[PDB]
């Protein structure tokens, strides 16, 4: 399917406003499980539930364990670019 590059802006006192599930230990990609209303992902648009996050800010998430992805994602700030594909 199409790999979309999706932009999101957030202040440091904000979360991304997504939940993720999956990861290498589960044999599945890092998947968006929920988009929280009113938060940056929702307000900025372009992300959807069921999207696999292939990368964030150029950092490949394709073979990451759940906790690694949590770390990487949680450390991104300001203008953030996701590369996602709906599965």
């Amino acid at each position: 399917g199409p790999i979309r590059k999706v932009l999101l802006l957030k202040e440091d006192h904000e979360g991304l406003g997504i939940s993720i599930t999956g990861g290498k230990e589960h044999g599945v990609p890092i998947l968006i499980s929920e988009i929280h209303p009113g938060q940056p992902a929702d307000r900025c648009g372009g992300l959807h539930v069921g999207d696999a996050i292939l990368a964030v800010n150029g950092v490949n998430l394709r073979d990451t364990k759940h906790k690694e992805a949590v770390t990487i994602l949680s450390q991104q700030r300001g203008e953030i670019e996701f590369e996602v594909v709906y599965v």
Partner: peptide
């Protein structure tokens, strides 16, 4: 899996 809010 786990489910983590970010």
């Amino acid at each position: 899996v786990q489910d983590t809010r970010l």
